[PDB]
């Protein structure tokens, strides 16, 4: 017997069109997206060229449109020049992301001020979200606060971060968080078999203790997203790794593993899957759109996923119970028991989607 | 210019049918909530008879599906006798209602051994809300965390209240809440006013320091619900008379002024109209349905709104901005400018469509 969800969505993926397609493109990572269950998916900036303007995200638009096999929206991204000229597509957008540290990147802001700057032009009523870690995460709330809004802490990792965002939420503050699986079922003592150039992340993984305060407050976390962030087997295992997992076809199979075993509820990994995301972001439902899955059948992660380029994953060995068997996108069958069966182009942007528009005063 | 807004829930009203169809009944009631923008409503178990029972629900979901004009879902009641004898029906409910105080309901359990029962045989995924009003909030919160489960409080309306429910999620419990209009936009300045008879409701109206807490802790408070419950102006002037406020057509108008004086934001009033309670109630989206609102249109609320049948208002002569100019709900217009467009019966219950079943394990 099936177990049927809403079509869940990840807030945070890397689908590295344009410019990085050997790691994944659209129709590679909306694929991988499908099999792990997710119908819609929020898309960071930090392609090459980058969406830190309207040329960039029109092209974007093109390349998701045409490629995309599930629903998407695309990121903007704050660079040291573009605060203030966001105005006329920032509603296109799923938000717009700040890279606040050293990471898979070169949206570098040097200065506090240039975040500020971002936090006063960018509209009020739209997402913003941050890569802040460790006291960043304390250096954005104060400049949240500042200047009067909301902020979304991207991928929380360790014990001293979500603490200090319960803390944050007990003043009232509005902000929330999301987590990433291999920062709730990886840690230190999975860095000898990874080694050191695949074991390389942002945030880094954390302790034993780091995991296990993540779990005790669960009540903290808004989302799960999976920051999917493919590199191919060659570029981590060489010279100069670059940080990131792929993660779109093994996060569901781990938190449904985790509920199997009692560790939180369906209602706890609907809420931050389905519910949470459409309300922090303001996206649309999806018409006729639905997942079935398998909570008995039980597996163990190979050395790759089949669909995304990463041809790599961290998670390998690992023993799961839950897997996707049916993915339905909008009155069609999209994925089947490891077949993919809505073509590149079937996905659309949800920002234009007349409900998918932020509501905003006139 | 219009300002589109979602489908707006509103997860606590009273439709008084069957057996008290002369203060309202499903027809009625649902054009009132068209008219303040509500597209779907949960109404609650304490009609004549109550909803206690599996042919008790059969009559009222015949009722409503015949009256309606909105969409719905029907609460079940706790009795002191169907503890364990509604597992059949209960995923055909919004949820399971505890009733732990005096107010306008014979549906009292006078041993919170009842209370446990309840918690305990009630399907473990599925929604309860309580009214519980000062100690009884802290009371059935104990009970909560026996049985290791969630619940809802209806109607929060005092300091000690929502400080309480404050200091539970600080905790990470889960708890929710709501909070009527009457609540935050009157208190004991205005009983004078309203006489003794039209004064009385269940919470009864609090104090300034009251009112003052609920606003200042705005970030607590996950939905706002009308509690609409209508009585005539007979029956609140008369000998006895019962608790109870209408407020489906004042509900908005009173929070979009308040949207309009910068006391909460658009956002603030849509993740507590909209998201919040699709989220604690597994409430489906509504297909091709939207509200569009005029932000900008002054008025004077009159001694009574059209379309209730409790013809009067406690909030006649206040000031308020902003007024509801179209409904459309799955694709028909169901109200305009004062005109109500779809007939009784168009409404349909939510929790018969696929994707308004409350997701569990097999
Ligand atoms: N997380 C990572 O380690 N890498 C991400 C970037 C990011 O989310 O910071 C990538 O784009 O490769
Ligand atoms: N609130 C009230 O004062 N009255 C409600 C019942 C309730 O919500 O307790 C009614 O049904 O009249
Ligand atoms: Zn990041
Ligand atoms: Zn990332
Ligand atoms: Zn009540
Ligand atoms: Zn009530």
Not at 252 to 264: I, Q, Y
């Amino acid at each position: 017997k099936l177990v049927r969800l809403p079509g869940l969505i990840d807030v945070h993926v890397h689908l590295r069109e344009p410019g990085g397609t050997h790691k994944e493109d659209f129709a590679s990572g909306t694929a991988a997206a499908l099999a792990g269950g997710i119908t819609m998916v929020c898309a960071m900036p930090n392609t090459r060229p980058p969406i830190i303007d309207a040329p960039a995200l029109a092209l974007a638009q093109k390349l998701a449109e045409a490629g995309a096999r599930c629903d998407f929206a695309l990121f903007l991204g704050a660079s040291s020049e573009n605060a203030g000229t966001l105005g006329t597509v920032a509603g296109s957008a799923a938000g717009l992301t700040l890279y606040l540290n050293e990471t898979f990147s070169e949206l570098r802001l040097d200065s506090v001020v240039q975040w500020m700057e971002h936090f006063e032009t960018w509209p009020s009523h739209l997402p913003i979200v941050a890569h802040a870690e460790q006291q960043t995460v304390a250096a954005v709330l104060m400049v949240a606060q500042l200047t009067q809004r909301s902020v979304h802490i991207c991928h929380v990792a360790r014990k001293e971060e979500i603490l200090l965002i319960k803390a944050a939420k007990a003043r009232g503050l509005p902000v929330t968080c999301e987590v990433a699986p291999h920062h709730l079922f990886l840690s230190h003592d999975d860095l000898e078999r990874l080694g050191p150039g695949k074991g390389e992340v942002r945030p880094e993984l954390g302790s034993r203790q780091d995991v296990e305060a993540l779990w005790e407050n669960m009540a903290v976390i808004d989302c799960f997203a999976s920051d999917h962030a493919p590199h191919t087997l060659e570029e981590k295992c060489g010279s100069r790794p670059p940080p990131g997992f792929p993660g779109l076809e093994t996060m569901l199979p781990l938190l449904l593993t985790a509920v199997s075993e009692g560790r939180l509820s369906l209602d706890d990994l609907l809420q931050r899957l389905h519910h949470n995301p459409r309300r922090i972001f303001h996206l649309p439902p999806q018409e006729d759109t639905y997942v079935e899955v398998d909570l008995e059948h039980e597996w163990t992660i190979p050395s790759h996923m089949p669909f995304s380029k990463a041809h790599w994953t961290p998670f390998e060995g690992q023993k799961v119970k839950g897997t996707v068997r049916r993915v339905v996108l909008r009155g069609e069958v999209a994925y089947i028991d490891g077949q993919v069966l809505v073509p590149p182009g079937y996905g659309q942007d949800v920002r234009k989607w007349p409900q998918g528009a932020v509501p905003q005063l006139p």
